[PDB]
Design a protein around this ligand. Structure first.
Ligand SMILES: Nc1ncnc2c1ncn2[C@@H]1O[C@H](COP(=O)(O)OP(=O)(O)OP(=O)(O)O)[C@@H](O)[C@H]1O
Ligand SMILES: Nc1ncnc2c1ncn2[C@@H]1O[C@H](COP(=O)(O)OP(=O)(O)OP(=O)(O)O)[C@@H](O)[C@H]1O
Ligand SMILES: Nc1ncnc2c1ncn2[C@@H]1O[C@H](COP(=O)(O)OP(=O)(O)OP(=O)(O)O)[C@@H](O)[C@H]1O
Ligand SMILES: Nc1ncnc2c1ncn2[C@@H]1O[C@H](COP(=O)(O)OP(=O)(O)OP(=O)(O)O)[C@@H](O)[C@H]1O
Ligand SMILES: Nc1ncnc2c1ncn2[C@@H]1O[C@H](COP(=O)(O)OP(=O)(O)OP(=O)(O)O)[C@@H](O)[C@H]1O
Ligand SMILES: Nc1ncnc2c1ncn2[C@@H]1O[C@H](COP(=O)(O)OP(=O)(O)OP(=O)(O)O)[C@@H](O)[C@H]1O
Ligand SMILES: [Mg+2]
Ligand SMILES: [Mg+2]
Ligand SMILES: [Mg+2]
Ligand SMILES: [Mg+2]
Ligand SMILES: [Mg+2]
Ligand SMILES: [Mg+2]
Lengths: 222, 222, 222, 222, 222, 222
């Protein structure tokens, strides 16, 4: 009566609203506007995995250099430089088949099953039509599932209440969709987290407030 | 005073609001946003048919592999692998004339009159103009009606309250239209099912709540 | 002080709100979203004419086969097969000059003055620009007026409260415009009928509810 | 302190809200959706002029034949056929320089200073860019002013509360702009008339109700 | 603590809300929909300057002939023909480098430092991209500032509450922006004047009502 | 637990809501509509730096000449001419690699670590696609970070509540985003300042009123 296994992301409150955490072997799409916490979410997923379960991670980035990410993480107190030196964490700088080959090579070398992709929207900006975007996204998700590494891919969206992704096709390809919203009402911004869908497993429905503190993302499972 | 015959879908509450179930020999278009339950609807239609009436089914999929669908079904407790091995269910992996020929060949081989199409939107993404989309959709619906197999085709739409399909032409070709809506109000999502039209037979008018539980879709015929 | 003659459509309540029925020799444009009753309106116009005034009719269809229309009509109790066999009704299957020639040939052969066109939108989908759409629509309307047969042409529109037709030019060519709206409010759908204009004769202003029952369209002239 | 002369249109109530009627020698743009009364306005202007001041008129039409206009006018009791036979009224059927030459020739032949243009939007549909539309409209208005005949040109607009014309450039070329609106509120339509501007003379500001009765347009100058 | 000099426009109430009038040597962009008073504003600026300070002016027009402008001005009681004959006012008929050369030649010949441009939108209609529009507008503004003549350039906008100009780039090039709005509420139109910005000097913030009377524009500095 | 250093902008109240001021070595994007205070913000940043910390600055401008900026600054009482003569301030007139080379040359020559860019939107207007805009913006930001000079780049946006930049990609490239809004409500304009994000450091959330007085921008840290 159950055939889905989940690995805990160890993010405070996210496992409660995801009913066990992120499913193992499936690629999640985390979408939100600028300043919501996509990069922080993808960094904290890998960092918590490495700290708790001793499971290494690979963080592929396109819009940032590794040093900037390390400084932003040390802002929270996470010494990612020590993890990179010890080999428990890998950071890949690519700034599509070659990217998948490099990710697979890193996964095999570091014996890591956890992947975070900071910006696939920047990669898809090169392509023109949304059909090609869907094809490339499906190819990447299929390769990630074949490898067997749980992946958190973050994409950018324009409007707080509108299409889940700018192209509008990301929501219909990824197995799991998580949405971060920075809603501006009454001249004040509020952060909300929503689990749009989880193919093959139950999850909470609605939006729940969360705060980006000095220790990382903290979701309130009200 | 009546010349329309209907086969029960055995979905809890859907037959009550459809006034006898899905008409026999006509192709339905089930449209909704991501995470509403189109794939689950198409899977449950075939599974309930096979279990109750011993009527085999063919499930043609484009955006997923058969193994993923089997795992997602086993999440509900449906052992689709046993049905596939016994021959009471067929799953087709195509990832347009060749597709119709393959569907007809499967129908003839398995002596099955029930077809589910998980994503024709992905197929239509290749075409550019909406006129070509209408032509291909009409060709597929005509072939399905000529074969005589009741079909449930699922398409993707962007906005909860907007065009029935992304191209806007699907609603005017399919004989029957069913709409699943995932409405986000008050930072909470609500699932609703609507029967937009049934060419040649009566149906309930409006939208009715439904829930995706661990046993499948359950519609409340209030 | 009057130079306009009208033939009664015999639709329950439509003659009351049209102040005498559809004008003779002019082509009406019946526009509405999917599931509103355009095809049923065009079928009932011809059927009521044949039954009451013994005036034969021609029903030209593009998106459907004659057999499907006959079955949908028999759902209401209308034995259109008997009328077709007796010659009192003709059904034309075209699935633009050749179409007009065929319609004129059918009109001359069957001595019928009543024409219904189920989908000119599908024909206009081939053309690209709205100017060509306007030119073709004007040509068809002029030919219909020259023939002298009262015509009911049905077109498709996307939004309940928006452009009268998808191209936006149909309203400015046809002499008479009738609008069927399927308004979704409070998670319930309501059917309304409106007479946008009647060139050269008075009509009621506003929208009136109507219901599609088992006997056909029934408008309430409140 | 005044250098503008006005000719009364004799339309009931329009002269009161226009403060003396339509200015002499300037071309008006009457814009409204379908079924508002543009064609009736242009016909009644010429008919009232001919009846009262014995000043002949020229009515150039593109979307209709003269016979249809004559029948629609006789619906109100206006025997335009007698006026055409007597030479007090001319009707031109053109279905851009040649059009202006023909209008000037008719004006010279019939010694008439009053012109109505039923559809310049249909003519402008041939052109692609709005700059060409503006150029052609300015050329026509300049030619009409050089001839010295008061002109009422009617154009089509899509939305009740939106751009004054479909192209959006008509309002900035014509000296005078009149807007007819058919507002649908509470499932009921209401007719309103507005004078957007009169270059060089004062006018009432706002919108006033008007009714199309069996005698013609009747505006209430509240 | 101050390095900006202003010349009074002598328009009733505009100097109060502009805190000293239009800055000397800078080009203003006056934007509004049709019928708001852009042409009247540009005419009254020059006329008041000539009458009060004996400072001649140049009025360059594109959408109108000089005679029409003279008649519209005489509607208010302004005998612009006498001023043109005396040489205290020049009217230029151009219906982009040649235009600037002609304006400079007129400025040098008539020893005038005041320029009004009635329609640069019509000139920019020839260009396709908004980048070229920005380049040409910047070139014209730079030439006007180099000449040293205070200029009032009027542009056309479509929506009452939307982009300041149709192209959306005029607001970011001109040093000073004034907006005239004709707001339609409650079936009544209200005229409002706003000073969007004044580069290098203070101004009132908000919108103030104004009326176009028989003596010209009159702003209420509430 | 902290690896981010900040240099105070000395703007009244901005350091309080930014929690220490602008981060050192990162490029900020200040976005707002016309008349909000982007140019004044970029000028005041450099001027306050030079006055307080004796840290020279470079102001690169595209839409204005240096003399106009000097006059607008002297409107506030800032004698930028004296600073330019003394060498404590440099103003660059460029009216993309050559621009970066010139900025680096100025930085090296004047031993200044502070840069303000008045209009990169005008530069990006030359490019067509938003992908090229993103690439050029990322290149410029990377070069600025490599140089090590704190930069304030100002971009233009159309709608008060809409995309952060006109292209919609600026918000996802710059490390820090500040938004100035000129909200028109009740026929009155209100100025608000918001810090959308600060990569790697905390900041206040919401919008706070600010006023452009005769001494410069003054933000109220309520
Ligand atoms: N130490 C911290 N304390 C609090 N908030 C922090 C801290 N460090 C970073 N942030 C938050 O990080 C946010 C922006 O950084 P983040 O990495 O989340 O960006 P993002 O949403 O992924 O951006 P993008 O869309 O450009 O990829 C800011 O809103 C800020 O509040
Ligand atoms: N065992 C389960 N219990 C409850 N809900 C489940 C279960 N398995 C799946 N779901 C539901 O399935 C939904 C998504 O899966 P589903 O197959 O319905 O997608 P879909 O709407 O067809 O997607 P797409 O638009 O990508 O084709 C989630 O919202 C989740 O709630
Ligand atoms: N026997 C019946 N009793 C009640 N309603 C019926 C019956 N037969 C058909 N209908 C109605 O017919 C509607 C759809 O069929 P119809 O022929 O009116 O479509 P349509 O609006 O012309 O479609 P399209 O836009 O695709 O041309 C349904 O909403 C259904 O309620
Ligand atoms: N005798 C009449 N009594 C009342 N109303 C009439 C009469 N004759 C015509 N009408 C009115 O004429 C209107 C449509 O005809 P009209 O000539 O005004 O069209 P229009 O607005 O110019 O159309 P288009 O946009 O297609 O050019 C209808 O709304 C109808 O009410
Ligand atoms: N003597 C007058 N008394 C009152 N109002 C007048 C008078 N003369 C002209 N007007 C006003 O002039 C307005 C239109 O003329 P105006 O020159 O202001 O047009 P505009 O806004 O510049 O037009 P466009 O956008 O076509 O350039 C009308 O709304 C009218 O009220
Ligand atoms: N001395 C001053 N006192 C008050 N406000 C001033 C003063 N000088 C300039 N301003 C303000 O400057 C604003 C416009 O100048 P500013 O340099 O801020 O433009 P901006 O927003 O950068 O423009 P753009 O979008 O064209 O680049 C006006 O709204 C005005 O109120
Ligand atoms: Mg980020
Ligand atoms: Mg699915
Ligand atoms: Mg139909
Ligand atoms: Mg008309
Ligand atoms: Mg004007
Ligand atoms: Mg500025």
């Amino acid at each position: 009566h159950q055939a889905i296994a989940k690995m805990r992301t160890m993010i405070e409150g996210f496992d409660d609203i995801s009913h066990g955490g992120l499913p193992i072997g499936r690629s999640t799409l985390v979408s939100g506007t600028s300043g919501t916490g996509k990069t922080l979410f993808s960094i904290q997923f890998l960092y918590n995995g490495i700290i708790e379960f001793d499971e290494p991670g690979v963080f592929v980035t396109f819009e940032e250099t590794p040093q900037d990410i390390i400084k932003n993480a040390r802002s929270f107190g996470w010494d990612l430089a020590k993890l990179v030196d010890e080999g428990k964490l890998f950071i890949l700088d690519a700034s599509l088949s070659a990217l998948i080959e490099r990710i697979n090579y890193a996964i095999q070398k570091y014996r890591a099953r956890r992947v975070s992709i900071d910006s696939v929207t920047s990669v898809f900006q090169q392509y023109d039509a949304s059909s090609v975007v869907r094809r490339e996204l499906f190819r990447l998700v299929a390769r990630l599932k074949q490898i067997g590494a749980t992946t958190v891919m973050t994409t950018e969206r324009i409007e707080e209440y509108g299409p889940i992704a700018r192209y509008g096709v990301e929501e219909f390809v990824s197995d799991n969709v998580v949405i971060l919203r920075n809603v501006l009402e009454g001249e004040r911004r509020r952060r909300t987290l929503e689990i749009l869908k989880l193919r093959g497993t139950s999850h909470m429905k609605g939006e729940y407030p969360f705060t980006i503190t000095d220790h990382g993302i903290n979701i309130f499972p009200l």
